[PDB]
Design a protein around this nucleic acid. Structure first.
Lengths: 76, 51
RNA sequence: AUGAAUACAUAGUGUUGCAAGGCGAACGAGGGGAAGUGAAACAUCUCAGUACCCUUAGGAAAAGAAAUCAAUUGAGAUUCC
RNA sequence: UAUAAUGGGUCAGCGACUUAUAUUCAGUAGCGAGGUUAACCGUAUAGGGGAGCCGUAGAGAAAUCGAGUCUUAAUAGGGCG
RNA sequence: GAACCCACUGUCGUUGAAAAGCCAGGGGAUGACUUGUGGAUAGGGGUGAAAGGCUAAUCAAGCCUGGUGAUAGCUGGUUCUCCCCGAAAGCUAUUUAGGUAGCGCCUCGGACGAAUACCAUAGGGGGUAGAGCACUGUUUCGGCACCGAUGCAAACUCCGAAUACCUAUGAGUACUAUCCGGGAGACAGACUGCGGGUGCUAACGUCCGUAGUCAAGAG
RNA sequence: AUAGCACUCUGCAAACACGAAAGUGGACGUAUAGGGUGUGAUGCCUGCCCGGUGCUGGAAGGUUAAUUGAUGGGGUUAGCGUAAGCGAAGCUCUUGAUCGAAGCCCCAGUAAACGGCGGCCGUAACUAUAACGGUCCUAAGGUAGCGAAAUUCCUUGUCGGG
RNA sequence: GAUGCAGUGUACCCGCGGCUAGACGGAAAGACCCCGUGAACCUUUACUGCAGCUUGACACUGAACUUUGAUUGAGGUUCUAACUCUGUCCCGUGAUCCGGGACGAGGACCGUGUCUGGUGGGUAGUUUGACUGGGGCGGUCUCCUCCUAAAGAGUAACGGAGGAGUACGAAGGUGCGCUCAGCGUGGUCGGAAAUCACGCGUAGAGUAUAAAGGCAAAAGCGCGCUUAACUGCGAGACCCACAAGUCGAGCAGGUACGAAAGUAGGUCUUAGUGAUCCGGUGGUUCUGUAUGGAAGGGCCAUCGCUCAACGGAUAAAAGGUACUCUGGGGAUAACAGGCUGAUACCGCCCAAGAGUUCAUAUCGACGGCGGUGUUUGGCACCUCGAUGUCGGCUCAUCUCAUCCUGGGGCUGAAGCAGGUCCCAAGGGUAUGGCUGUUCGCCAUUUAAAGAGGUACGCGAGCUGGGUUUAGAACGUCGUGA
RNA sequence: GCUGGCGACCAUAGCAAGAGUGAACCACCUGAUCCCUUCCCGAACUCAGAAGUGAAACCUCUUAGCGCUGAUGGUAGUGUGGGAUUACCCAUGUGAGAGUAAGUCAUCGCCAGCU
RNA sequence: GGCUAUGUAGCUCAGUUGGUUAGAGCACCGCACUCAUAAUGCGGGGGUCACAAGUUCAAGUCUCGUCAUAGCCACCA
């Protein structure tokens, strides 16, 4: 007999809205286990590190700061 | 194991919350300030049996 | 009419007269009463008071004239659609 | 599946998606904000019979309201309309 | 040891002379013996010196008629003609695994038209192929745990494509997308190429992803 | 199956069996008889274990049924109350004090009742073995007799005869 | 596993007597094996009933004395009149039934009805999971993390590795504040390693717990005050068969910490879980079977499942069948065939060494490359509306990797013999003891007693000793079948 | 031309080494009365000030010493079509990582104060 | 769930509702007795009377709870 044979259900993480797309306030942009992306202007952060839009506009990805963090923001 | 308890409003409205507690480390009866919606004020809630 | 234990009687016994028994379709009334099956298994439940067994009427039978319903204080025996 | 997997020796005759009720959808006909009778009566497919059913209002567990209603302290928000 | 009652061995017979026999041998043969006639025991019952034996050529529950047209997610079968479209063998759940239900895929009616697709530009995230040793492990040879040369990795990464995927604009081409209803079937797949797990880099093996063909397609 | 053996039940309206009952067999019998169970002429014999299950005999402590119904808590309303509310009696819903048998738990006996009958390590003057000894657990650890057997995997065990 | 397909060889048309190698020949919808939420019968400390047996209460059921327990209970002794007699006598009556009468022996017992506890395979109805490279045994069944997974999501195997069925009133909120680990120097016990001081390069520390993704405004670590581990919601999205699950700005009320802008709807996140039914508890401006109440019900909050076979068939369930049976499957096992060749057998390459010296007369280590289709296996493609046998007998046919006989090369070949390799398939190639044996051991022969294929050739050609139905026994296993 | 504050950007920008500045600013500095502070300490935080210094620290300059950036060309991989099956070849499109040449001791915005 | 009964040295049984003012028997070690031994006799050590609280002038001894164990009974989401 084998001692293996277990796995967990999928979690369907990932980028939901890509750069250049138009969003409405409340739209989820990124599902992520940790902060692979950080929240920029007009973007909020949930309790499970989800990134969501807090205004209507156009999504933009960038890299900024002294730590080289990846940021996502919404331009109005 | 943690046991389930009720926290009952002292205002007499009968409103109550439910929670758990470790009886080994908290033998005394819980008392905590909480919001009572029947009177819309914060009052003291006291431990009672889950029943 | 006759006639014990047993004294009166009674039981018992005999004669005459009258009546009944049996058969046959379905329907009626009453006494008993399954399981296959369904529940996607199965025991509560269902099948179903069905199948079957038994007793016994009539042209029909059963029921029937409120110790019944109703809820503006009203209806007015039973049976069938 | 030529299969060395099944069935048929041959002919003639028979042999398997039905019937009743309810419901939903489509077509067609009558009438149309209305439509339609059932049991029953009836020298009887006619004509009577409007009890009842469907449509015309929704919300709420319900009392209740009603183009609104429920939730709520809320005329906010939101759900069914 | 004859009659009578049995049935140990062998050949024959096996669409037999016979649905249990013939023939040659065999056992008991005054006894717990054999046999006629007439009776008793009736089906979860009878009877059994006991084999689940026998109970009318029928016995781990006789036969007949009723319940009854029992139920069968199983097997078989399902009858004249022409025209149009045309699948699936997947996901999820199931005392579920050869059944079924919702979704995916087919068809028909209605609504609505450019909201759709192909391709070209433009915007976007990645951690695979490859590669590398900066982390985690592992490896060889030197020097004094470090230092220098040198390899390796599905569960290592300082790096990192091609494709694929999402969005916007646009030319041309195409009866395209979408919504509301009636009817389904199907939920046993197979081989081949490419990327893999498993196996022996075995199998016309087995399990996934992806494309073609068969299935349901002749030449 | 059997003659023989043993255990056990049965005092007669017997135990036991058939039957719904009436009744019938047992038996027109009476413990030298009748039923059930196992063993199986005869010879020699038949060891240990009552912890388990069963059976037999005790015991009156714990637990427990119906029945009984003490208390406590509610519903209703005459009345009292400005009102809030309080609220007898009578009906009524509920609660269950006390009493309460067998059985079970407990104690003995019983194996020709169903059943059971162990392990580890050492020791005598060469070598071997152990009359012998230490230790653990059981209710007890197989007596007589027999043994590659209708029982023995290894196995065609080894030796002897043919 | 082909009379019917391809290529090719052979073959004028038709009987009769024989024969059984094939027509996977005929016969019986396989009995072995698996499956169906099939059947029957049997067993039991499976579940649930019932008969039977048994206990007590009430009834049939009465009268007198007495003794004793905590007003009541219990016990004892007498009696007759209910009731019993499968005891005697008389009568109906020509009668061992029955009925009535008279005695005698018992007697409020026994016994029967209703209720009630116990016992109850005697009897009855049933249950006894699924996945599975056949089934059984073993393992597994829900959730989280990584890889497989092919740079969006998703993606299987009885594939490779680990965790969960919790914890915390602070380990939550807030304001303020602080940086780890290791190493080198010095310094009482005190050192490898305790605490103190100063420096060097450094996130290698920590984050309640497994892993991953994260963590300087630190999400890591302290202190003070505190309860936002609130109530009503909620634009908009993620995920998705359904049922469910996830994120969420913002509005209103009350609140905590801040001077304030503000932050707070539990904890860095992702596991720590269970639908419906049935009931319990706290509230409630709902309902209330004539009316007023009430009982009951509804609504809001909350409680009870290792229902772990984790979408949970019942409140409640184990086994045997060789005494067996039905519906099905070559969807799925045992035989033979097929694919494959791990294993098996045979051959070759290199060559340390052995051979007094001398790798190669004869052997040949450590390693490497193939062939065959005999063995043990892997797979499950054909056959379950049947391809029906281990050995012996009878009769065979083919291959050559040759046992004998024939022809050769080398030799550590003097001769006789032997060793090794090459060519060669024409013919030939034991009888018995033991055992069911094939095989094997043994005895005695022969020039030799070869190795294999042919459904492990051959049972519509024979047998039937073994295996594998129904009877019976022993050892062993089980309470038992 | 220097000094301070707040930003853009996040190594061609950093690290290391050497050098320089006190008029103003900054820094060290004096003290512990009052405000406030140490799980002890006026070290930090805080308050009251100017006797000193540019030592330390911060800033500015120089250096390719570590680090960082980095072509061209070639190689690996790869979509489509074709040919082969140890997994390569051809046509076409695309194209790393490493290494080589080489580069780098940053570049900008607002406000205020001095000379 | 309900009703009961227990838990005392190295090993065992008492002590059981107030002034418990925890002892008895075997294990040991030492001493004595003996020509040498026992048995026996003596001494010492070896628990802190299931735990946590309550009343009280008296608590292992009683009342409340929390453990472990045993006996009977009851369990239809």
């Amino acid at each position: 007999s084998t001692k293996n044979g277990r796995d967990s259900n999928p979690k369907m993480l990932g980028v939901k809205v890509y750069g250049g797309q138009t969003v409405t306030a409340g739209n989820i942009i990124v599902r992520q286990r940790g902060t692979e992306f950080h929240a920029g202007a007009n973007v909020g952060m949930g309790r499970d590190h989800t990134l969501f839009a807090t205004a209507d506009g156009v999504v933009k990805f960038e890299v900024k700061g002294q730590f080289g963090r990846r940021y996502v923001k919404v331009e109005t | 194991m943690r046991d389930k308890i009720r926290l009952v409003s002292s205002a007499g409205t009968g409103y109550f919350y439910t929670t758990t507690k470790n009886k080994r480390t908290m033998p005394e009866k819980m008392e905590i300030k909480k919001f009572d919606p029947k009177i819309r004020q914060h009052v003291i809630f006291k431990e009672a049996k889950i029943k």
